[PDB]
Symmetry: D3
Subunit: 243 residues, 6 copies
C-alpha cells in the first residue's frame, strides 16, 4: 500500500524508501508517505532517525515522468513539499542519518544533504545529474550542497552532473564515512544513540543556526545551549561519575 516503510532497529527509527522497481524515485505519493512516516518516527521513543532505500539503491532522484508533467504551478507545489520535508529533517530534535547505497542521486541525495550525517556503502554512486534534463536542483542541491563541499565543488557537481564513487564523495565532504558492510554502519549509528538526547539536539540547532549569523552571535548561542544542558537529567547523569 505504501511507498515508504517505517521500521525499528534498537534505538533507531528506520525509514525506508520503497519503490525499487523505479529505483526508489520520488513521486508525489512517495513524498506524501515520507512526510507521514517521518512524523511517526519523530513521535516514537527512538533516539535517531535513519533514512535509507529498499534493495540495492537509496534513490535515483525525482521521478522523471512526474517532472515532465509539470507546469510552473505544479512544479512550485512539488518543491514546496520537498522543502517542507527537508526542513523537518533539519529541525528535528533527533539526529537524522542517511545511509547511502547504489544509486544515491538528485532529489533523493539532496534530501540526504539536509540530514545530519551521511554514511555510504562502498558501492554507492553519488551525484546530482538532473542538470542534464534541465533541472537546477531537487531539494538543496544548489543551496545546501555548498555548505558541505564548498562553493566551487557545488557548482561543478551541479553543472557537470558528475557521478562520484563513495571515496570521492567522502573526500569532498559530501559523505562522512564509507563502510563495506552494513553492520559497520549500524555500529556508528548505535554509538550516536548512546549520547544524551538533549545534547545532540543542541549540537544540531547550533550547527544549523551558524549559517544564519555572524560568529559572536553564534558563540553566544552555543554558550546558552551549553548552559541549558545543565537542566537535563540525562546530561547530569552522564556527568555523575565525576561529581
Amino acid at each position: 500500500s505504501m511507498l515508504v516503510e517505517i521500521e525499528r532497529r534498537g534505538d533507531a527509527s528506520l525509514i525506508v524508501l520503497s519503490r525499487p522497481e523505479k529505483l526508489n524515485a520520488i513521486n508525489l505519493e512517495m513524498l506524501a508517505d515520507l512526510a507521514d512516516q517521518f512524523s511517526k518516527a519523530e513521535k516514537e521513543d527512538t533516539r535517531v532517525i535513519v533514512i535509507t532505500g529498499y534493495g540495492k539503491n537509496f534513490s535515483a532522484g525525482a521521478d522523471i515522468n512526474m517532472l515532465a508533467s509539470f507546469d510552473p504551478a505544479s512544479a512550485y507545489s512539488f518543491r514546496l513539499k520537498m522543502n517542507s520535508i527537508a526542513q523537518r529533517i533539519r529541525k528535528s530534535d533527533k539526529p537524522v542519518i542517511a545511509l547511502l547505497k547504489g544509486y544515491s542521486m538528485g532529489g533523493g541525495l539532496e534530501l540526504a544533504e539536509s540530514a545530519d550525517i551521511r554514511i555510504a556503502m562502498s558501492d554507492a554512486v553519488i551525484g546530482q545529474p538532473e542538470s542534464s534534463i534541465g533541472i537546477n536542483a531537487g531539494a538543496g542541491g544548489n543551496v545546501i550542497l555548498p555548505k558541505l563541499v564548498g562553493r566551487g565543488s557545488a557548482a561543478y557537481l551541479a553543472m557537470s552532473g558528475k557521478k562520484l564513487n563513495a571515496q570521492e564523495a567522502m573526500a569532498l565532504g559530501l559523505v562522512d564515512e564509507v563502510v563495506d558492510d552494513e553492520a559497520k554502519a549500524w555500529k556508528i549509528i548505535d554509538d550516536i544513540c548512546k549520547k544524551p538526547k538533549k545534547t545532540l539536539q543542541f549540537i544540531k540547532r547550533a550547527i544549523n543556526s551558524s549559517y544564519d549569523m555572524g560568529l559572536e552571535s553564534a558563540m553566544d548561542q552555543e554558550a546558552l545551549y551549553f548552559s541549558l544542558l545543565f537542566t537535563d537529567p540525562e546530561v547530569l547523569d552522564a556527568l555523575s561519575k565525576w561529581r
Copy 2:
C-alpha cells in the same frame, strides 16, 4: 608572434567563448592595460551567442598575479582605484548569466588565481602551480583571496594559504577544494567544458544564482529561492524540450 599583440585575446571554440590573458613575457601578470582589456573582452564574450566563457592564459602559464612594478607605483588612492577595477571584473564573472570556467596551468598565482576563484569552475592542468604569494610583498589579496577563498576551502586553509604564501601542486589544490578537476591533457578539459555546454542555459544560470546567493541568507530563505527558480524553469523552451522524451 607579430600578430599576437593585445593583452587579452578573445576566441571561440564551439559553444564556448575563450578569453586568453596574453602577456607571456611577463608570465601574464596583470597590469592596468590588461585589466581594461579583460573587462572589454569579457563584455564581448557575454554578448556572443556562446553558452559558457572559458578563461585561460597564453602559453605555459595562466598568470603570475598582479604586476609588481604597478603595485610598487601605487599610493592609497591609485591602489583603491585598481582594486575597484579588479572587484568589478570579479563581480561580472559571478553575475554572468553564463558559467565561467577557469583553466589553470603553470603559474596560477595571486590576483590572477583570485579572479579564477570567482569563476564557477576551476580545472587545472597537472603541471599547475597554485597559490597566493602576495603577502610576501605586503599585499592582503588581489581580488577575493581573503573573502572568496574561504568559501572554497574553509576558514583555516584560507588563512594558512594567504598568510604563508604556500605553493600548491594541482592535486593538493584539488584536495583542498580550490580546484575541481585535474587533467593531464587539454582535450580532457574541453570535454568537461563541452559537457557543460549541453545543459540548458537557463538551468545553469539558475544554479549559479542560487549558489551565489546561498552565502547571503539563511537556509530556509535559500531553499525558498531554489524552489522558485525550479518553477520558473518550466517556462523555458530548452528545459521543456529536454524533458519531452518523458512527457505524457
Copy 3:
C-alpha cells in the same frame, strides 16, 4: 601558574601547563590563559603561538569542573571561554596552534579560533565531549563547520570520533602535519617575515567574510588593500620594484 609565556625569536609562545591532568582546562587555567594572552599581545613579537607542555596539547575541559556546574556557573564558564576565543580571533597578531598528542574538546576548540593549526604527526584530534552530554566547549558547533563543512562538523561533534593528524588535515581541521618540531617553527618563522599590517588585514577580512555578503566583503578587502599603502613596512617590502 598553569599557563607559561615564553619567547622564541619573533614569536610569543604560550604554553598550557598542567600535564598531570593532560592540560585540561579549569577556571584557574582560563584566568591564567587570559592574562598570558594579554602579555603576549603587548610584546613586540609578531605572532602568538599556543601549545601544551609535554606530550599533549590539551585533553579538553576539566571534567570534574564540568560535573560541578549548574546552569548559572556553566554560563559563566562559557562566557569566559567565549571571551578568550574572541580575543584570539580579534588579535592584531596571527595566532598559531601547535597540536600534539591529545588535542581535544574545549582545548581543540580554542585552537579552532586560531588562524592556523599545525599538528605533530602523533596528534589525536577530536571533540569527544558529547559522550558526557556537552555540546561544545568553545566553537565546537559554530566555528567547526567553517573549517570542515556542515556535514563533517555534525559528524565529528555527534560521534566524538578521534582523528589522526592526516585525517584531520584532509578534513580541513588542521593546515599542516609535520614529523618534527623544527619544521613547525620553520612555517612559523616564514609567517613572521610578512609585514604585520598585511597579516592583520588578511585576518580581519577572512573573519568578517562570515558576517556579510560577497560584494560587501570584496568592498572591504579593497579598502584594506588601499590602507596598506599607508604602512611603512609594506612600502619597504615593495621598494625593490619602485
Copy 4:
C-alpha cells in the same frame, strides 16, 4: 463538557476567521492552557476557507500579558519550555499563508502585545493601552519584545520601550510604527479588514513572505525573490481574473 471552558474561542465573520482570547477575569493573561488552546484554534483557522485571520481579546481588553503567577512558578527548564511554545505560535503567525491582523484594545501588553508584533497588521481601538512592562518584574520579553520590536519601531525605541516599560496610548504607538491604524469604532476596523479580504489570496501570501524574508538577506537577493514571486502570480487564477478587465 469541553465547550464551556475553552480559553480561546474561534468565530467566523464574513471572509475572516476571528480568534478571541477569552479569560477576561484575568485580563486575558496568557497561561499554558491558553497557549495550548491558541495553537489549536490557530490551526483550525488556517484550514478554514477564510481569507484572513483576526486575533483579539474578549471584552474590553486584548491581553495584559503573560500570567504572572505562572511566571513566578518557573525554573529555567519550565521557563524555556514556555518560551518554546510562545515562539512556536509566533512563528506560525508569521509563516501563515493568510494575513494575520491583531485588533488591539484596552490593555494590550507584554507577551500578548508581543504575539501581535508577529502579526502582519495591528489595528488599535482609541482606548488601547499599549506597552511592554515586563522588565519591571525581571522579564526580558514574552515573544519578540526584544527581537521583533525593533523591526517595527527601530533600535532606539525598542530599547527604550523594553527597558522603561513605558505605557503608550494608541496615537503614540501609531507614531512609533507599533500600530498601523487607530479607529474610534469597531466597524471601522472591520472595514479595513474586509478591504484586505478583497485582494487575491496568493498576492497577500507572497507579500507576506517577501517582507518576512527581507530581514534574512541582503537587498539584491530579496529583490530577486520579489521578482520570482511576482512571476509566479501569473499562474494564479484569481490574479489573472483580477487583471482581465484590461486584457488586450
Copy 5:
C-alpha cells in the same frame, strides 16, 4: 526627419543636477517596456555627465501612476519575470550609482514608479502628492521593492499594511512614516534642497551612500569597520581637503 523617433524619458540639465523626466502624461507616466528601456538609457547618460546629482521626476502633474496595467494584463509568467528583471536592474543602478539620486514626487506617485523612487537616496514630495502601493488590488505583490525595500524605509508593520491595504497617503503622512524626506509647496523649494546636496563633496556623498546601502548586508562591527575605512580614504580626495582647509593649522 523621416526616421524621427520619440522618447518616453527625457534628460535635461539643471546646473549641477542631471534631470530625468518620465514623459508619458497621457497615461499618467505609467511604466511600460519602452519607458523602461528609455529610462535605463537616460540614466546611463546622466551618470556619464559631469553633474553631481541625478534627479528623477515626471512630466506634467504626475510622477507616475505605476506599471502600465494593459502590459501587466498581457503577461504570462515568463514575460512577467523578464519585466521584473528589467525593473530590478534599473533599481539596482540607482542604488549603486556614485551620484546621489533624488526623486521628486508629485500628483500620482504610486506602485512601480514609487517603488523605483524607494531605491533613490532621497525623496522629496510636492504637497499634492498621492503616494502608495495600490497594486495588490489587481493581484500584484510589488513592482520594484515594494515588499523588500519598503520595510527598510518605514518598518515591518507599515510595509505590510501599506502593501496589503493599498492605502493612499498624502505627502505629510508619507513623510511621517519615513517614506518621504521633505514636503514642499512649490518647486523652487525642492531645488533649494537639491542645491544644498550639490554643495557637499562628491566623494563624501558617494561613501555615505555605499555605507548606508551595505549596512543592510552585514553586522554592525563589520559596517563600522567599513565606515572607518571610507572615512580614511576621504583624506585622499582634493575636494574634501579643500572643504577642510579653513581649519588647517
Copy 6:
C-alpha cells in the same frame, strides 16, 4: 584627576547612575584625541563601579558639537584611520556594556558626539536640543555610526537624507524620526526616567540589550531562539526571582 581640577571628561555618581560628562565647553565639547582617550578611561571606570546605568552628557549648555575640526583638518589617511578606530572602539564598548547607557542630549548635539550617542541604548533630549549630522559639509561621511547605525534608528531614507543634507533638527523632529526616545523640558524629568530604569533587575536589562543588538545580525527565528534562551537564564538570577516573589505559590 581630583574634584576641584577641570578635565576634559569628568566622571560623577548620581544615585545608582554613573554620570560621564564631556567637558570642553569653550569649544562646544568638541571631541579631540585627548577627549577620546579620557572618555575611554572614564567609561572603564564607570563599568567597574557598582552603579546600575551609565549616563553620558555634556558640561554646560551643550552635549557636543562634534569632532574637533582643527583635528580633522590635520589628518592624513593613516591618522584619520587611527582616529576612527578609537571612535569605533568606544562606540563598541557602549554597545557591549552589561549596563544600559543613556545619552542626555541638550543644546548642540551633533556629528561625532551625536553618533556616539546613537550607540547608546537610550537617548533623551532636553527641549532646546539642536540635533544632526552636519559633517558632510566639511567632506566627512560620519564620525561614529552616522551612516551604519543611524539607519537602524530612523530607517534607510531618513538616514541618507540626514547625512547627505546635514539638516539640523529640533528635539520634536528628532523624536518623530526615532532618533531620540523622549523629549523633556526639565532635567529632573530626565532623571526620573533614568531612576525608573535603575529599578529593574540588572540581568534583565543586560539581556534586553544583547538581544536587541544581536537581532541585527540574524534572521528572526534565530533571534527568537536567542531571546527564549536569555529568558530562561533569567530564572537563575536572584534579583529576577526576588522581583517575582510576591506572586510565588
